[PDB]
Amino acid sequence: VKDYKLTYYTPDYTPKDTDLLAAFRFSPQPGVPADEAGAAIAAESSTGTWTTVWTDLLTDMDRYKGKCYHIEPVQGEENSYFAFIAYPLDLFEEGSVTNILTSIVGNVFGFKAIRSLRLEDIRFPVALVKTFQGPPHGIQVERDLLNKYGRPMLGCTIKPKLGLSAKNYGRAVYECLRGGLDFTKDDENINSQPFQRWRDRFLFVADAIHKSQAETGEIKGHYLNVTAPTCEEMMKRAEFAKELGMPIIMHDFLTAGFTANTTLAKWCRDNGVLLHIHRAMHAVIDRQRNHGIHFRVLAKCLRLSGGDHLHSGTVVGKLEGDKASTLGFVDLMREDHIEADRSRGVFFTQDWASMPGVLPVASGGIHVWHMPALVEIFGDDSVLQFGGGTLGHPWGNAPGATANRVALEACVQARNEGRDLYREGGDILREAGKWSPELAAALDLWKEIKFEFETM
Amino acid sequence: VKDYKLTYYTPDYTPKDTDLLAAFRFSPQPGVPADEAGAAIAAESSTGTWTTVWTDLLTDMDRYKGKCYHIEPVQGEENSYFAFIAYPLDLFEEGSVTNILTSIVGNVFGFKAIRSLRLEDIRFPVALVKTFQGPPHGIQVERDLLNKYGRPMLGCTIKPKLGLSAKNYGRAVYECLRGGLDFTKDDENINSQPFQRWRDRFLFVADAIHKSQAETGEIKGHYLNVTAPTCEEMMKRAEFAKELGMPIIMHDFLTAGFTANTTLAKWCRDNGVLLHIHRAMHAVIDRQRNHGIHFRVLAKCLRLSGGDHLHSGTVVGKLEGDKASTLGFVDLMREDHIEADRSRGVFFTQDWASMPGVLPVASGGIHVWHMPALVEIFGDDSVLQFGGGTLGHPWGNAPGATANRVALEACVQARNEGRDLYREGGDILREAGKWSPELAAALDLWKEIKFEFETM
Amino acid sequence: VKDYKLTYYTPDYTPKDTDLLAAFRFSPQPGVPADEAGAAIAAESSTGTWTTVWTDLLTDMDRYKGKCYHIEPVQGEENSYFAFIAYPLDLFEEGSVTNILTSIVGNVFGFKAIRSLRLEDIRFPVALVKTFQGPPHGIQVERDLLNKYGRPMLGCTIKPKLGLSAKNYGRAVYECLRGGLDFTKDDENINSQPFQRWRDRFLFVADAIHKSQAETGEIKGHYLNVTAPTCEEMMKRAEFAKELGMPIIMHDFLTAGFTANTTLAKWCRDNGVLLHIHRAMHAVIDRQRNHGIHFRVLAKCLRLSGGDHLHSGTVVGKLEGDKASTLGFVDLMREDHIEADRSRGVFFTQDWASMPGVLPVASGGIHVWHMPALVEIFGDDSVLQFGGGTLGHPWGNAPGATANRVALEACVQARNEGRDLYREGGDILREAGKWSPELAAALDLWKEIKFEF
Amino acid sequence: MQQLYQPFRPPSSPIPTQFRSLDSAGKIEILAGRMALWFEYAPLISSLYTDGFTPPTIEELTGISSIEQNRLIVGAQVRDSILQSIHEPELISAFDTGGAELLYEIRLLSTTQRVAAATFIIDRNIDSKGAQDLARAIKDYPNRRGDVGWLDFDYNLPGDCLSFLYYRQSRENKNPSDQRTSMLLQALGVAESEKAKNRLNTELYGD
Amino acid sequence: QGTKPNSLVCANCEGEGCVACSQCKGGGVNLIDHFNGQFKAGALCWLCRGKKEVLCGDCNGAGFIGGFLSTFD
Amino acid sequence: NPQGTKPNSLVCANCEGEGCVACSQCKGGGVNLIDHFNGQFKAGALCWLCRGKKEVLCGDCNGAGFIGGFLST
C-alpha cells in the first residue's frame, strides 16, 4: 500500500491447515524490490488491489485475499527469489481442477514488473483432497484385476510404423503379446485417419488379444487411444471398446484438457476399465527452468482429476541434480504422506488422506542392459515400455518379447536373494543369457553401459 | 369434554371389521386420571379437540375421529395402563406405510400430561392389507428358487475382519461357500469406502460365487449391500448386481427409511431377486420397556412394505418371559391366521389374507452345541447365521463350514426319527463327531451348554 | 498384550482434526466399572474386539478402531458418566449420512452390560463437512428470493383440515394469504386420502396463490406436502408442483428416511425450489433423558443432508437449562463457528466451513401476546407459525391475518427504537391496537397478557 | 495341459533335501495339507512353477492365492540369505510361524545389512509399515554424501540410519514450533550409537 | 507511473487509492456556481457530492502501477 | 459371563483378555499326544487341533477377549 507493509506481505502469519499454499520462483525487473514483487504476485492472483476502495463497503473483504507469508533468495542464482503465498479455501469450487488452475495461474504470468515467473509446487489441504474422486482404481486394485504380483510389468509401443493396415497392426500386436509381454500401446498420433479408421483397428486388436490370452493363460491388454474431437465421439469410442471386453484405454490429458479427462475418469470408474494417461505437449510448458509450470504440479493435478498410469520418464541417464527431482516427484504420486525435503524438490508436507496412488511408466529408448538399473530405481510398482528394444530383435517380434521377459525375471529373481544390482548387473545378465539363444542375441547387439565407477 | 364422558371414551362401542386398532401402554403424571388420559391419547392421534367448535360447520364431524374403547390396568405394575383405541379406515392412504406411522405415532409421544407411552401392537384390517404388495417372493417361492427342501439354511457373516482388499474378500467368500454353506453376508457397515469401493467388491464376489457353484452343484449366494446415499445410487448398485446374475441383495430398513425400502421391494418384485432386510439401529427405539415402539409393530410394517428375510434374534439364552414374546412375533410373520393370546404378546386377532410370509434369521455368537436347540425351536423355515462359529475353526475356513454342515444334517436327520432334541442333543452331536475330524475339532474348541435341568 | 490394559481407553490421546468425535452419556449395570464400559462402547461401535487375533492377520489394524479418551462423570446425577470417543476418517463414505448413523449408532445401543445410553453431541471435521451438499439455498439466498427483509416471516397452519373438500381448502388459503400472511402450511398427515387427492388440491391451492399474489403485491406461498409412498410418486408430485410455479414444498425426514430426503434435496437444488422439513415422529427417539438420541444431533445431520427451514418448537415457557439448551442448537443452525459452552449443551467446537444456514420455525398455537418475546429471542431470522391464533378470530380469517401482521410489525418498529420488547410488550401491543379494530378484538379474545416477571 | 509358448522359463529350481524324490502329485498333496513349515514348502511352489503350472492353477488345486505364494517364496529366499551368514540361532528359531510378511519388506537390502536389519525389526517389535520405512531410509542414506552432520551417523547400524532420516527431516523447519521437537525426540528414541546421541543432545537441548 | 525504487506504488496518491477531491479540494462544497446552474456554489460539490474524495485517476483506485489486473492499459 | 479377577466388564476369565489361549493337546513341540484312527496327526509331530501353532481361540469369548453383549465373534 505504502511504506506500511502492504497488508499482503505479512511475515508474522502462519497458515491454517485449510489453506492452499503455493511457491513461486520469480525474477523481477531492474529497479524493483523483492517484497513489493511478492505482495504484487499475491494481489494479482486474487482481488487485484492493495487498497480498500472497491473491496470494502460493509464487510466483504480481507477474507478472499491471498496473503504472502514468505520470501527468500535462491542459492546460487542472483536476482531470483522464492515467494510462498497462501490462499483461503472459499475461493475454490468443489471438485474442479479447471477452477484451481484458472484462479492461481490465471493472469499473474503476464505481470509486467516481473521478468519471469515459475510455479514450483502446491499444497492441497485434506478438506479439498476429499472432494475429488481420484484415480479410478489405483495400485492395489489395478494389480489385483490383472493378477500380476511381484515384478514390474512390461509393454511395447509400436512407434516407428505408421501407415500400416489394420490387419497387419493386429498381427504385430498378436506376435508381441504371445511372446511374453503384458501390454501394448498405440502410437499417440493414431486416431481415425484415412488410412486407418478407428473401428477397424479396435476390431482387429481385440481379436489378437483374445487369441493370445486364450492360448497363453494370463491376462493381456492394449492401450486403445480414445482421444477424439468431441465429448460425444470420445464417449462413443469408449463404449465400443468396453463392449469388446477391453481392460484398459488411453488418453492425452494436455491437448484434450481437464474437463474431458475428468469426464472420462468418471466413466471409467462407473464401468470398470483402467485409464492410462499420456503426457504429450508438456515440454511446451515445463522445459525452461525460468518460466512455466514445473511438472510435479501437473502430476498432482492428475492424481486428483483421475488416471492410473502416468508417464514420468526414465532416470537412467541423468545426474543427481535431476534424478533427485524425478525420484522426489515419483514418491509424490505413489505414497500417502510425503515430508518436506528441498533436495528432492518437495517444498511442502503433503498428506493424501488414503487416496490411491498412480503408477509410473518408464519409457523411451531403453534396452536389456538397463534392466538391472530400472528394477531397483523405480522399485517393482511401475511399468516399463520398450519402444525399439523389442521390435528390432535380429529375428522377429516374439523372440524380442521373450528376451525382455527372460531378462526381467532374471534381474528380479536375483534382487530378492540379496545380490547387488549396481555391482552385478552385467554378470547377472550374462549368466542368464546362456541357456537361451534369444537373450544371447539381444545382449549381442545392444551394448553394455557401465553406469559409473561401480555404482549409481 | 366435561363430566360428560368426553365423547372419545366410549366403552359400549364395539369396533367394525374395517377399523385399525392400536394398543398403547401408558403411564400418566401424578394427579391425572386414567380415563382422561385415554381420551386425550385418542384426541391427539387425530383432530386435536374434544369439542365441536372447529370440526363442525355442516357435517365434517364423527367420521375422522379416534374413539377409545377400552382401558385396563397392567398386572404387577402400578400406575400403568393399557388403552385400546380404534381409528376409521378413511384416514389412511392406500399403499403407504409412512402415512400410517405419521398418523398414529405422529405427535402423541410428546403429550405433556403423559409420563411415558409405548405402542405395543396394531391390527390392520384385511381391506388395508390388500392394498400393499407384501414380500416380493415369500417362503415357498423363495424355497423353490434355491431348491433347498427339508432343512434350515446356513450362512456365515464375515464381521470381525476389516479393511480387507477386494480380492481377499472374494477369496474368503469362496472358501466359505465351497465348504458347504449356502449364503454369506456382507458386514452392514461396508459401503463404498476408500479402502474398498463397491464395484470391485461386487466383481470379485460374483466370480467366487460362480466358481464355487459350478464346482459344487447347488445354488450359492451372497447378500450384497446396496444401501446408498440416494435413490439413484441405490438403483444403480441394484441394476449392476442383477447384471452379474446375483440371486439376493440386502438393505437396512431403519436408517434408509420406508420410502426407499418400498421402492426397492417393487424393483425386486419386477426383476426377480430376493430381498434380505437387516434391522440396524433398532435398539434406539425398542429397548426400554416403558417408552418407544415395540418391535412386533415394525415386523408387521415390514411384512407389509416388503422383504423376504428378517433378523429376529435368537432365543437360546432367554427366559420364558421373553422367549414367549419372541416366539409370538415369529409366528406373527410366518403364518396366515394368529389368534389373540396375551401370554405371547399378541393382543389382537390378525388375519393376513393369503399374503406370503417372511423368513426369520437367527444370528449372533452361536456355535455347534446350539444346533439341537435352534432346529426344533425355530423350525425348518429359518436361516441360521454363524458369525464366529465358522471363521474360527482351528484349521481354516472351509473346514469350519464342513463342520457346521455335518452338525446340522445330523440334528435334522435325528429329529426325523422321533428322537428328542432336549434330552439327546449332546450325545447326537458326539455320535456324529466320530467319523469326521472337522466336527471333532469343532466340538472340542467350544463348550457344551446344558440348557436347563433336562429340557428347555 | 493382556487386557488389563484395555488398549482402547487412551487417556492421554489427543484427537486429530480429521477425527469424528462423539459424546455418550451412559449408565452401567451394577458391578461394572466406568472405564471398562467406556472401552466397551468404543469397541462395540467398531471392530468388536479388544484383542488382535483376527484383525492382525497381516500387520494391518489399529487404524479402523475408535478409542475412548475421556470419561468424566455427570454433576448431580449419580451412576451416570460421559464418554468421549474418536473415530478415524476413513471409516465413513462421502455424501452418505445413513452410513454415519449405521456406523456410530448401530448395535451399540443393544449392549447388555449398560443400563442406559444416550448420544448427546457429535463433531464433524471440515474434511467431511465439505463433501455433503448442504442446504439447497440457505438464509441469504432465500431472503433474496422472497424479497422480505428486516423482520420474521409469518405463517399459518390450517386446523380444520379433515373432511374439507379441495375447493373450500383453496378458499381458506386465499382468505388467509390475502390478509397479510406470508406462508400457509399443509397439515402433516394430509397426503392422498380418498376424500381429498393430491392433484385436485395442488390445483386449487396454486389458483389461490396466483390470485392473492397480485392483489396483495407480496410473494405468497404454501408448503405443499410431497411425502409419498415411493421415490417415483415423490418425484411426480415435486415435478407437478414445479410446473404450476410453486416456490416451496414440504417433507418429513424421520418417517420417509434420509435416502429420500437427500434425493429430494438434490432435486430442489437443481430446480430452484425451497424445502421445508417437518419433524414428525421425533419424540419416539428423543424425549426421555435416559435413552435415545438428542435432537441437536439430528439437527446437525439435517443441516448436512439438506433442508431450508426446520421446526424447532417454542422456547417461551421452558424453565431454564431446558430453555438455554434449545437456544443452544438454534446457534448450531444459523452460526458458522460455535465455541464449546457446556452450559448450553454444546460439547465440541464446530466449524462449518462456510456452508449456508437453516431457518428456525417456532410453532405451537402461539397468540398475539407472545409477539414481543419471540421477536427478541429468535431474532429476525425465523418463521412464526400460528395455529388457532389466526383462524379463531371472531370476524374471520382475513381479520386474524391482519391482526397478527399489525402486531408483528409494531413490535419490530419499537425494537428498532430500542424499547425493551419484554418489558414494554403489553404496552406496545396496547397502543397499536387503538387505531386498529382487529388488533383490539384479538387483544381481548386472548386474555393471556402473559406477565413478564 | 501345456500352456503354449512360455519360452521365458528357468531350466529348473532347487528342491529341499527331503522331497528330492517326489512327483508332482506328492508336492500337491503336501501343499494342500500344510504338512510342513512355510520355509519347507516354499521351494515346492517355486519348483512347481517350472513344470507348466501357473499361479492360478496352483491356487485352484492347493488353495493359496497368488499374493501369498509370491510372499512365501520371497520370504523363504530372504530367510535363507539370512541363515547362511553370521547370526545367532534365536531369530531363525523365531521365524517359524508367521515371519513371511516381515521378511518381505527387508528384501530390498543386500545380504550384508540384512542380518543387521532383522535384529532391529524383531527387537523393537515392528510391523510392515515401520519395516518398509526402515528399509527405505537405509537405502536413502548413501546418496546424501554431503549434508549437515552426515558422518556423525554410522552406516552399519540401522538405528542410526533411521535417526539420520528423522534428524534431517526435522532440520527442514525452523525453531521448535512443537513440530521439530517431536521429530528430534523421535530420532533420539531410535538411535543407538554415542556420537548420534551427543549430537542430538547438542541439537535438542542447549547449544 | 510509480515512485521509482519501489516501482509499483502509485506516485500520484502514494498508495491511498482514493484522493482528496480535486474540484472542491476536500471541502465538499462547490467553489463556484456552474454555468448550467444545476450545481451551485456553497451547496454541494458537483463532482463528489460532498464525500470529499474520489478515486485517483492514475491507478483508478488500485494503488497499483502496471498490474495486469487493474489499470493494465 | 466370566469376569477375570475382580468384577469388570466381563473381560473373559477363561483367557483374561488374551483372546487366543494355549491349545490343550500340545506340549512343547506342538506334538499330538492323542493317537487316532484317521492317523493324520496320530503319528506325532503335528498336534491334531492346532496343527502345530500351539494356540487356538478361547471358547468362552471366541477370541473377542470380553463378553457382555459381544460374546459373538
Annotate E25-56 with DSSP letters as a single string. TTS-S-SS--SSSSS-TTT--TTTTTS-EEE-
Q: Whose CA is closest to E56, among E21, E26, E4, E5? A: E21
Contacts of A36 in chain E (CB under 8 A): 6-9
Q: Tell me the three cell numbers of residue B385.
A: 447365521
Q: Whose CA is closest to B391, among F33, C49, F37? A: C49
Residue F1 lies in a domain: no
The catalytic site residues of B sit at: 159, 278
The rounded distance, in Å, linking the Cα atoms of A103 and A122 is 13
Which CB contacts under 8 angstroms, 24+ apart, belong to C50-53?
C50/C3, C50/C6, C50/C7, C50/C8, C50/F11, C50/F17, C50/F19, C50/F64, C50/F65, C50/F66, C51/C3, C51/F17, C51/F18, C51/F19, C51/F20, C51/F63, C51/F64, C51/F65, C52/C1, C52/F19, C53/F19, C53/F20, C53/F57, C53/F63
Residue E61 lies in a domain: yes
The chains found to touch F (3+ Cβ pairs under 8 angstroms) are B, C, D
The Cα of D152 is separated from the nearest Cα of chain B by a number of Å equal to: 42
State whether A121 and A142 are in the same domain.
no
Asked whether the CA dihedral A287, A291, A293, A294 is positive or negative, the reply is positive
Give the phi and the psi of residue C228 in degrees, each rounded to 5.
-130, 170
| In chain C, residues 76-95 whose CB comes closer than 8 Å to chain A | 89-90, 94
- E40 a known binding residue? no
Q: Which of A65, A159, A242, A323 is catalytic?
A: A159
State whether B302 and B387 are in the same domain.
yes
Counted domains in chain A? 2
Q: Nearest by CB to A417, which of D5, D81, D172?
A: D81
Q: Nearest by CB to B195, which of A137, A270, A354?
A: A354
Q: Which residue among B102, B132, B162 closes a domain?
A: B132
Contacts of A354 in chain B (CB under 8 A): 194-195
The rounded distance, in Å, linking the Cα atoms of A173 and A190 is 15
| B150–chain C Cβ distance below 8 A for any pair | no
Q: Are C389 and C368 in contact (CB under 8 A)?
A: yes
Asked if C300 is an active-site residue, the reply is no
State whether A69 and A182 are in the same domain.
no
| In chain B, residues 430-449 whose CB comes closer than 8 Å to chain C | none
Q: Which domain holds residue E63?
A: 6-67
E7–A113 CB contact, under 8 Å: yes
What angle is formed at CA A274 by the lines to CA A270 and CA A280, rounded to 5 degrees?
A: 120
DSSP state of B4: T
User: Counting beta carbons within 10 angstroms of the beta carbon of residue D199, is it exposed (0 to 12), middle (13 to 18) or buried (19 or more)?
Assistant: middle
Q: Are A271 and B239 in contact (CB under 8 A)?
A: no
Q: Are C275 and C251 in contact (CB under 8 A)?
A: yes
Q: Are B271 and B242 in contact (CB under 8 A)?
A: yes
Do C and D touch, counting CB pairs below 8 Å (3 needed)?
A: yes
Amino acid at B89: L
Please give the sequence-ordered ranges of beta strands (E in DSSP) within A253-336, or none if there are none. 274-278, 292-293, 309-311
Reduced to 3 states (helix: H, G, I; strand: E, B; else coil), residue B283 is coil
Residue F25 lies in a domain: yes
**Site of grid cell 426397492:** B264
| B171–chain D Cβ distance below 8 A for any pair | yes
Q: Whose CA is closest to B359, among B130, B182, B121, B142? A: B142
Q: Mind giving me the DSSP string for C249-304?
A: EEEETTTS-HHHHHHHHHHHHHTT-EEEEE-TT-TTTSSSSSSEE-HHHHHHHHHH
F57–C53 CB contact, under 8 Å: yes
Q: Nearest by CB to C131, which of A90, A130, A354?
A: A130
Closest C-chain CA to D128: C59
Output the domain CATH number for residue A203: 3.20.20.110
A272–B165 CB contact, under 8 Å: no
State whether B145 and B94 are in the same domain.
no
State whether B113 and B144 are in the same domain.
no
Mutate to test the interface with A, among B162, B167, B193, B195 (most CBs of A within 10 A): B167
Asked whether the CA dihedral A228, A234, A236, A237 is positive or negative, the reply is positive
C58–D128 CB contact, under 8 Å: yes
State whether C120 and C207 are in the same domain.
no
Question: How far does CA A141 lie from the centroid of its chain?
Answer: 19
Asked whether the CA dihedral B313, B319, B320, B321 is positive or negative, the reply is negative
C44–F11 CB contact, under 8 Å: no
A53–E55 CB contact, under 8 Å: yes
Q: Mind giving me the DSSP string for C83-115?
A: EEEEE-STTS-SS-HHHHHHHHSSSGGG-SSEE
The rounded distance, in Å, linking the Cα atoms of E70 and B403 is 80
Q: Which of A278, A282, A367, A393 is catalytic?
A: A278
Q: Which domain holds residue C120?
A: 5-132
State whether A125 and A166 are in the same domain.
no
Contacts of B171 in chain D (CB under 8 A): 65
Contacts of D34 in chain B (CB under 8 A): 395
Alpha helices in B147-197 (DSSP H): 166-179
Q: Are A240 and A169 in contact (CB under 8 A)?
A: no
The rounded distance, in Å, linking the Cα atoms of F1 and F70 is 11
The rounded distance, in Å, linking the Cα atoms of A256 and D122 is 52
Q: Tell me the three cell numbers of residue C129.
A: 463437512
Counted domains in chain F? 1
Q: Whose CA is closest to B325, among B363, B297, B290? A: B297
The rounded distance, in Å, linking the Cα atoms of C70 and C23 is 10
Residue E72 lies in a domain: no
The rounded distance, in Å, linking the Cα atoms of B305 and C230 is 11
Q: End-to-end distance of chain B based on CA atoms, in angstroms?
A: 53
State whether C296 and C342 are in the same domain.
yes
Question: How far does CA A359 lie from the centroid of its chain?
Answer: 8
Residue E49 lies in a domain: yes
DSSP state of B63: S
Contacts of F72 in chain C (CB under 8 A): 48
State whether A153 and A111 are in the same domain.
no
B195-208 as b/e, with b when 16 or more CB fall inside 10 Å? bbbbbbbbbbbbeb
Asked whether the CA dihedral A384, A387, A388, A394 is positive or negative, the reply is positive
- C279 a known binding residue? yes
Closest A-chain CA to C89: A353
Q: Tell me the three cell numbers of residue C187.
A: 397439515
Reduced to 3 states (helix: H, G, I; strand: E, B; else coil), residue C380 is coil
Q: Mind giving me the DSSP string for chain D?
A: ---S------S-----SSSTT--HHHHHHHHHTT-S-HHHHHHHHHHHGGGT--HHHHHHHT---HHHHHHHHHHHHHHHHHHTSS--HHHHTTTTSS-HHHHTTGGGS-HHHHHHHHHHHHHTT--HHHHHHHHHHHHHGGG--SSSS-TTS-SS-HHHHHHHHHHHHHHSS-S-TTTHHHHHHHHHTT--SSHHHHHHHHHHS--
Do C and E touch, counting CB pairs below 8 Å (3 needed)?
A: no
D205: Cβ contacts below 8 Å, ≥ 6 apart: none
State whether B103 and B178 are in the same domain.
no
In chain E, residues preceding a discontinuity (C to N beyond 2.5 A) are none
Q: Nearest by CB to A111, which of E4, E62, E68?
A: E68
| In chain A, residues 314-333 whose CB comes closer than 8 Å to chain D | 320
| D97–chain F Cβ distance below 8 A for any pair | yes
Query: Count of residues for chain F?
Result: 73
Query: What residues are paired with C254 via a beta bridge?
Result: none
Contacts of A51 in chain E (CB under 8 A): 15-18, 61-63
State whether A303 and A407 are in the same domain.
yes
State whether C337 and C442 are in the same domain.
yes
Q: Whose CA is closest to C252, among A11, B107, A23? A: B107
Mutate to test the interface with A, among B199, B202, B203, B243 (most CBs of A within 10 A): B199
Q: Whose CA is closest to C404, among C421, C422, C388? A: C388
Q: Whose CA is closest to C256, among B99, D91, D106? A: B99
**Site of grid cell 528441498:** A342
The chains found to touch D (3+ Cβ pairs under 8 angstroms) are A, B, C, F
Q: How many CB pairs under 8 A join D and F?
A: 6
Do A and F touch, counting CB pairs below 8 Å (3 needed)?
A: no
Q: How many CB pairs under 8 A join A and D?
A: 67
Contacts of B175 in chain D (CB under 8 A): 63
C293–B284 CB contact, under 8 Å: yes
Q: Whose CA is closest to A265, among A220, A305, A223, A316? A: A305
What does DSSP say about strands B274-278 and C337-338: parallel, antiparallel, or unpaired? unpaired
Q: Are A107 and A37 in contact (CB under 8 A)?
A: no
- C438 a known binding residue? no
The rounded distance, in Å, linking the Cα atoms of D155 and D142 is 8
Output the domain CATH number for residue A70: 3.30.70.150
Structure method: cryo-EM
